[PDB]
Design a protein around this ligand. Structure first.
Ligand SMILES: Nc1ncnc2c1ncn2[C@@H]1O[C@H](CSCC[C@H](N)C(=O)O)[C@@H](O)[C@H]1O
Lengths: 265, 265
């Protein structure tokens, strides 16, 4: 009679909360989805071993089209868990699944876990200064989406930071790198000429948040565009004007050039 | 030889990540602060029992003025952990403490935990639509903070949602309720008269996120301003223009007036 939405956290199998783990262990059935994002620091096998339960993976179609036929029927007479990378309901489509549960007469509860949305606090940038977020999508064919560029423009002009989720082909396990994102943004700038993203733009790259050894780098595009930030996933941030405290953290912790203390504050 | 900043999560001792727990259990010394937020579902005793270590609680003064005198000295010859509610670097000034650690020759690591900043996803509002955040602080003496009002105005004009952290005075055991926040906002409105926050404004309240049964309510200020949302902590949200699916969730899950389903495109 109960469905638990349980977050797996940021990177590996230990990023689930103690609450989420103990609840998952007591569930009769455990499902999981890895299409909204991936858990790059672990494997399905390691997650399964930790929980001690067989984990049935669901595709985007399984969920978006058949959640009420695959998961809810079992949740009617058993305790069922639905695992998702990060924090449940951060992904925009997740929330509606709770309405489906209600419609089916199934109680649902949410067990939170760390999300990249909040983990970016490790960049030293004040969380309150982050504005609207956006996703950099790979262009393809004759389709060249650029809405993320406008998001940076609107946030930056108001002195706010912009969190940029990078494209991911979950099924193929292909991650867009911060380098590719920077190249794309420079390409968009060359087309819109808005003066929003150039070689002189200060950016911050956060790779493998959740890991004990994440890569946190800050610097100008001209210097970071060909830099190796390590294995995925990568997150790109275009900060707005910096509070001196944010700048000092970027210099001392993220290796930012001293120049940001006089140019970006 | 190291200092760990470990988050404890949203509500109770089990909101800590497995990673955080396994590391905390092996540390030589464990310190913590409980003034940046309120974990309403646990006690120091329960946290100590879970981690299996004595926890030395520090006051805001101990941390802000003497972190380098109380904590860092031990981290030079021992494995030390510094625990905090939620995520250690979200809506706190703890990031700067990493700079102090560095200057002291102490390597530091960060272990994330569920944060209210991302837990708001449980309101059904799209996380990417949240703009700049703000804090509603208690007025004191002849000083009446009003900056949060301008944040709402700025976000709303852009169609973005506004997350409002509520004030906390841990030593006095005072936790601002969503009701008190709404009352303060109505007073600022009468002063600035910007038509930003009135009796007809739609708001969302999230109380005790992290618990299994948090209070999630949406409605007009005139109706919710005197409603009992249960024990603290509380957070207040002022939505911007709603997507149809956001409205549907607020109606179905947060008990919002069905009239909000009719969005004005
Ligand atoms: N479980 C919870 N439910 C509702 N609001 C919460 C909450 N935990 C924190 N808050 C809100 O956030 C304020 C503390 S701000 C510090 C937040 C913390 N670092 C985190 O990551 O969550 C509180 O005064 C309250 O308004």
């Amino acid at each position: 009679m109960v469905l638990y939405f349980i977050g797996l956290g940021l990177y590996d199998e230990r990023d689930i909360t103690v609450k989420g783990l103990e609840i998952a262990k007591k569930c009769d059935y455990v499902f999981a989805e890895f299409y909204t994002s991936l858990m790059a620091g672990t494997t399905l096998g390691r997650i399964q071993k930790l929980i001690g339960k067989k984990i049935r993976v669901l595709s985007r179609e399984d969920v978006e089209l058949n959640f009420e036929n695959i998961v809810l029927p079992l949740a009617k007479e058993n305790d069922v868990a639905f695992l998702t990378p990060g924090d449940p309901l951060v992904a925009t489509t997740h929330a509606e699944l709770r309405i489906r549960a209600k419609r089916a007469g199934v109680e649902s509860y949410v067990i939170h876990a760390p999300s990249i949305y909040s983990a970016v606090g490790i960049t030293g940038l004040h969380i309150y200064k982050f504005g609207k977020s956006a996703t950099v999508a790979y262009p393809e064919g004759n389709w060249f989406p650029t809405s993320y560029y406008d998001v940076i423009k609107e946030n930056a002009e108001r002195g706010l930071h912009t969190l940029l989720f990078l494209d991911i082909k979950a099924e193929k396990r292909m991650y867009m790198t911060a380098n590719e994102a920077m190249e794309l943004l420079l390409k968009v700038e060359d087309m819109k000429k808005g003066g929003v993203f150039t070689d002189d733009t200060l950016v911050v790259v956060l790779a493998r948040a959740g890991s004990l050894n994440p890569t946190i780098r800050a610097g100008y595009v001209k210097d970071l565009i060909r830099e190796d930030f390590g294995d995925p996933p990568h997150i790109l941030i275009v900060p707005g004007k910096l509070h001196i405290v944010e700048a000092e953290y970027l210099v001392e912790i993220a290796g930012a050039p001293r120049e940001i203390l006089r140019v970006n504050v």
